[PDB]
Subunit: 379 residues, 4 copies
C-alpha cells in the first residue's frame, strides 16, 4: 500500500486535472455525446493516456494499482473520461501480454511518449455476449495472410482506434482452444464501421459496430499461437474487471460527494437536512459501501501487480460489489437531492445513468458472481 513518490505525485496531478479540467467539461460531454478529445490530448501530454505501456516501448509502465487509483479520481468527475483510459489500456493488454517480441515492437512503439493514437478490443458479437465461445468471426490462413470475416458490437472506441485486437475462430471445432487474437490496423481493406449506438449513459464515448468483409491481415499479426486467443482474452478480463471496479468506486464517490454537499447546504424544517437522522443514515450506508468497494478494488489491483493467482477471485468480488455500489449509491444520491437530483444540470442523474453500465460491461454481475462462486467452491 506504500505508494512511491512517483505514484503520489501522479495522483496529485490527476486530482488537480480532474477537478480543474475534467469535471467542468462532464455535463457538456454527456449532453452533446462528445468524444473526450481535450482529455485525450491532455492525458497524452501528461503521460496519462497509456499508463500500462511498458517503458521498453516508450511508456510510463505504472502498475495496475496506480491506474486503479487514477480511474477512481476520474470516475468521481466523469465516467466517460475514465472509460477512455479503460478502453485504451484494455485494447493494448492482449499485445503486451501475449505478443511476440517482434509483434510488440511493431505495434506498441507507435504509442510511445505523447502519442494520441487509440486502441480497441473486439471480442463481443451480437451472438456472443457472455457466451464468448459462440462468437462467429472466423480467421482463415491463406498463404502469408489470414482472411477475417465476421462482426463485432459494443466495441468501445472501435471506429476511431488505430489498432484493434480482434478475436476470431481459426478452428471453430476446438471451442476454447480454437480462438486466436489478431492485430487489426485502421485502414485495412475490408474493415467496415457500423452504427455508433446511442446509450443510456457513458455518452461521452464511442460505441462501435465492426464488420469484417474478407479482411486480409498479414500472418505476422496473430497474437501468440493459433488457438491461444481465448486464454489471452481471459487473462485480460481479470484486469479489465479491476479497472471497471475502480471506475465504479469513483462514480459512487462522486455522487456521494455531491449528496454530502447538498445535505450541508439544503435547508428544510429550519436547519440543514444533514441534521435529519434518516439523511445521516443514507449517507452512512452510501459511504460504508463506497469504502468497502474501494478496499476490495485496491486489494485486487495489488494482487494483479504481484502476479498472484488469487487476483481472479478478488477482482471478481471487487467488480461485483463496486458496480452494485455505484448503482445503489447513485440511485440514493439522486434521492438525497430531491427534485433537484432529477434535474440534468445537477450531474448526479448522469452519474446514475453512467453507473448502470458498470454492472454490465467487462462481464455482467451475473457472470462475475459465477466467477467468484466457482473460484470459492472449486479451488
Amino acid at each position: 500500500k506504500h505508494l512511491t513518490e512517483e505514484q503520489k505525485l501522479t495522483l496529485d496531478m490527476v486530482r488537480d486535472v480532474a477537478t480543474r479540467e475534467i469535471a467542468p467539461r462532464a455535463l457538456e460531454l454527456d449532453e452533446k455525446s462528445l468524444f473526450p478529445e481535450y482529455a485525450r490530448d491532455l492525458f497524452a501530454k501528461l503521460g496519462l493516456l497509456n499508463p500500462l505501456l511498458p517503458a521498453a516501448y516508450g511508456g510510463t509502465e505504472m502498475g495496475v494499482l496506480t491506474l486503479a487509483l487514477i480511474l477512481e479520481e476520474l470516475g468521481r468527475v466523469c465516467a466517460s473520461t475514465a472509460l477512455l483510459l479503460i478502453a485504451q489500456t484494455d485494447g493494448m493488454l492482449p499485445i503486451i501480454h501475449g505478443g511476440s517480441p517482434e509483434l510488440k515492437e511493431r505495434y506498441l512503439r507507435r504509442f510511445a511518449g505523447e502519442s494520441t493514437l487509440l486502441t480497441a478490443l473486439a471480442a463481443t458479437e451480437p451472438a456472443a455476449g457472455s457466451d464468448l465461445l459462440a462468437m462467429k468471426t472466423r480467421a482463415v490462413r491463406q498463404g502469408d495472410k489470414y482472411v477475417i470475416n465476421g462482426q463485432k458490437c459494443f466495441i468501445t472506441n472501435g471506429s476511431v482506434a488505430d489498432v484493434i485486437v480482434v478475436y476470431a475462430y481459426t478452428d471453430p471445432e476446438k471451442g476454447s482452444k480454437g480462438i486466436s487474437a489478431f492485430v487489426v490496423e485502421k485502414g485495412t481493406p475490408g474493415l467496415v464501421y457500423g452504427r455508433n449506438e446511442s446509450k443510456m449513459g457513458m455518452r461521452g464515448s464511442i460505441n462501435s459496430e465492426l464488420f469484417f468483409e474478407n479482411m486480409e491481415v498479414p500472418a505476422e499479426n496473430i497474437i501468440g499461437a493459433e488457438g491461444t486467443g481465448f486464454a489471452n482474452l481471459m487473462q485480460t478480463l481479470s484486469t479489465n474487471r479491476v479497472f471497471c471496479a475502480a471506475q465504479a468506486v469513483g462514480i459512487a464517490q462522486g455522487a456521494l460527494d455531491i449528496a454530502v454537499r447538498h445535505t450541508q447546504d439544503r435547508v428544510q424544517f429550519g436547519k440543514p437536512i444533514a441534521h435529519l437522522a434518516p439523511v445521516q443514515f443514507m449517507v452512512a450506508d452510501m459511504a460504508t459501501a463506497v469504502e468497502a468497494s474501494r478496499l476490495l478494488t485496491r486489494k485486487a489491483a495489488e494482487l494483479l501487480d504481484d502476479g498472484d493467482k488469487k487476483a481472479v477471485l478478488y477482482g471478481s468480488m471487487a467488480k461485483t460489489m463496486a458496480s452494485d455500489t455505484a448503482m445503489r449509491v447513485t440511485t440514493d444520491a439522486v434521492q438525497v437531492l430531491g427534485g433537484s437530483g432529477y434535474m440534468k444540470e445537477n450531474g448526479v442523474e448522469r452519474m446514475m445513468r453512467d453507473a448502470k453500465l458498470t454492472q454490465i460491461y467487462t462481464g455482467t454481475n451475473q457472470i462475475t458472481r459465477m466467477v467468484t462462486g466457482r473460484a470459492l467452491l472449486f479451488p
Copy 2:
C-alpha cells in the same frame, strides 16, 4: 374488487389504446421531449382525460380504483403519458373537494365532455419541498381581490394549464392554519412562466417554474375558507400518492414484460437464457415485487373510494413500495437485456429513468415512510 361492466369496458379500451397508440409513440416522446398532445386529444375524445370530474360537471366520475387501473396500463408503455392524467386529476382535486358550489360550477364546467383544457397544482417552491409550511408565496386580500406574490417550481403542466390551484399564505404566522388555496387562470396579469427544466426521465412532460408578480385574482377564487389551504393540500396528497403508486406499478410491469420477452428470445449457451436458473430467479423477484405493489395500490385505491380513514396508511405503503419496486425492477430489467438494455432503442433504459421520479414526487419515500410509521405508532 368486482369491477362493473363499465370499468371492464373502459380498461379494455385503455389497454387497446395503450398498445396500439401510446406505446409506439413512447420512444419519440422521450427522445424529443414532447408534450403528449396526441394522447391528450385522444383521451379527451374517449372520456379518459378527466376521469374524476364529477358527472354534475359533465364528467365521467370514475372511481379512484378505475383511474389507478388506467394508470397501471399507461405506465406500462409510457410513464409520461400516465403523468399527464395524474397531473390533470391532481390539478382538479382541490376544487372538487374544497370548492364552494359556485366555485365548482364556475371553474369545473369548462372541463366537461371532450374538453382539452389543462389543470395544474402549484404548491412546491424552491424553499419548500418536503417542508411545505416554509412556502413563501403570499396572498393579501385587498378589497374584492387577493394580491399574489411569490413563486413555484416543479409544477407539472404549469406553463400550459388553463387553471392552476395555487397555495399561498394568507396569515404567515398561523403555519398550517395560515395557508389558502386559489384558482388561477391562464392569462391572469402578473402570472409569469420560467424555465421548463430538463429532467432525467419523464421527458414527455412539462415541468414549470411559476412567478407571481402582484398577481390579482378575484376574491371569489379562494378554495374554501382562509386558512384551510393546508388541509386541502393534505387531503389531495393521499390521492396523489395512490396515483403515483399505480403509475410505478405500470412502469415496473412494462419493464418486466420486456425482460420476460427477452429471456425467451435471447439465446446464449445453446438455449434461451430463460433456461438459466439465475435469470429465472431475477424474474421471480421482479414479478413478486410487482404483484405485491399492485395489490397494495389496489387496496389503497379502494379505501379512498370508500372514504375510509385508513387510506392514508395504505396509500403511503403502496406509494413507497410501488416506487421502490419500479426502481429495482427497471434497474434489473436493464440488467436482463445485457448490453442491449443499455441502448436507447430498447426502451427499458427510459423506464429506468422514468422510475426514479416516482420515488421523489408526490412526496419522497423518506417523507412517506414517516407518514406510514407515524400512522402505525401514533394511531
Copy 3:
C-alpha cells in the same frame, strides 16, 4: 374476499383463543420443547384441528382461505401451534385429493368431529430433499400387499401420527411416473421411529426420522394408481406453500406487534423511541412488507379455493415473499427491542428462530423462486 358469517365467527373465536389460550403458553412450549397437546385437544373440541376434512367424513370443510386466515392468527402468537394445523392438514390432503371413495371412507372417518388423531406426510429422505425424485424408499407388491423398505426424515408429527402418507418408488426406473403414495397406520409392523431431532426454532413440534423394515401394508392402502404418487405430492405442495406463507405472515405480524408496542413504551432521549425518525422508518418497512405478504397469501389461497391454475404461481410468490418477510421483520423486531429483544423472556427472539424455518420447509425459497420463474418464463 367477502367472508361468510361462518368464516367471520370462526376467526373471531380463533383470535380469542390465540390471545387467551395459545399466546400465554408459547414461551414454555418453546423453552421445554413440548408438543402442543392442550391446543390440539382444544382445537379438536372447537372443530379447528381438521379444517379441510370434508363434511362427507364428519369434517368442517372450511376453504383454503379460511385456514390461511386461521394460520395467520396462530402464527402471530405461536408458530409451533400453527405448524400443528399445517402438518395435520398436509398429512390428510393426499388422501382427500387422490384417494378412491373406499380409501377415503376407510381412513378419513376416524378424523370426524372432535377426533384428536394425528396425520403425517412422509416424502423427504436424507438423500432426497429438493430432489424428491432421488428418494430411495421402495414399495414392492407381493400378492395382496406392498412391502415397504426405506426411510424418511424431517417428518413433522411423524412419530405420533395415526395415519402417515408415505411416498415410495414402485417402479424406480420411471422417475416422476414411478412413485406411489400409501396410507400407513401407526402400529404397522416394520414401522420404526428414529430421533426427534432438535431444532433452532419451532421447538414445540415433533420432527421425526422414520424407517421401513419390510413393512407390509395391504394393497388397498395405495392412494390412486401406481405411478401417480409424484403428481399427488406436487398437487399438495401448492397448498402447503400457501399454509406456510400464511404462518409466516402471522409470525411477521406478531413480531411487528411487539416491536410496535415497545416503541410506544420504551423511553430514550426524553420521549418514547416511537418519536425517532429511524425507528418510524423500520416500522414502516416492516408493516409494508407484512401487508404485501398478507395480500399475496390471501390471493393465492382464493385461487386454490377456486381451483384456478394460477394458484401455483401466486402460491410460490406468496411463500417466497411471506417467509423472507418473516425473516427480515423478526430480525428487525429483535433490533427494535435492543438488548431486551435478545432476551428469551421477551418472545421476539423465538419468533426470529421460528421464522427461519419458513424459508426452508415446504420447499426452500431457492426451489420456489424456480417454480415462480419457470411459470412466468414458460407459461
Copy 4:
C-alpha cells in the same frame, strides 16, 4: 499491514488453538450455557487473555490489529469465546487510558502474566441504553470515599469480574460533563448481583444485573478527574466497536466455511449442489461481504493503533457492516444447509443466533449509523 513475526506466530498459535481446542467445545458451551473456563485458563497460560495489558504491568501489549485478528479466528469457531476476550479487554481499557499512574499500578498489576482474574465494564442501565446520559447510578463523595447507589444491566462477566469499571453521575446536572468512572472490586460491601439473564445466543457467557446499595469505594478508585467519565467511556467505545466488528467477521467466515463445505459434499440432482448456479451466487455474495467487512475492520484497527482521529468513522463503518454481514451471511448459511442447517447439531443455527447480538451490543447499528453519518456530514 506488514505483520511482525511476533504477530504471525501468535496468530498461528491462535488458529491452531481455535481449531483443536475451542471449536470442538462450542456446541456444548452453547447447549449448556457454560462459562468458557477451559478457554480462559488456557488463554491465560498462553498470554492471550489480556492482549492489550501494557508490558509495564506484566502484559503482552499487542496492538488493536493483533487482537482484531485474534477475534476473527475465535469468532469463526465460537462467538462466546471471542466475547470473553472482548469483555476482558473492554473492562480494562478505561483504567489503561484514563487512570493515574498510581491507579494503574494498584489495579492492573493483578492481571500480569498468567493471571486468570476477570474485568467488566458497567455503564448500561435499564433506563439508559443508547441514551447513556440518562443513567441514574450516582456517586457521592463523603470524606475519603465515594458512596455508589444505582444499578446496571447487560454487564458481560459482571457477576464474576474481580474488577468492574462503574460509570456514575457525580454531578447529575452537568450531563456529559457530570459522569465519573470508578474501579469497583469483587467483594466490596454493597455490591449485589442480580439475574444472569438468558439470551438467544452467545450463551457461553455471563450477562449480569448489578446493584449498588450504599456501596463505599475509596476515593482513590476514581478513574481520572470528576466529570471526565463520559469522555472516558466514549474513547473506549471506538475500540469496542472494532472488536465487535472483528468478532462479527469471524462469525460470518465460520458460517461461510460450513456452507462452503456443505455445497461440496451435499449431492442433489446427480451432482454436488456447488454445481448449481444459484448456490454459487449465494456463496459469492456471502464471501464478498465477509471480505469487505474484514478489510474495513482491519483498516479501523490500524487507525486505532496509529492514534488516528479517523478511527471513529472507520470503526463505526466496520462495526455496522461487519455485524449486518454476520447476520445476513449466517441467515444464508443456514439456508445453504437446508433442513440440516436448522438442526442444532450442525452449528450454523447457533452462529445465526450469535450473529444477531453483534448488531446490538457496543451500540446498536442505528446508533453507529448516526456516528458514521455525523462524522461525514459534520467533519
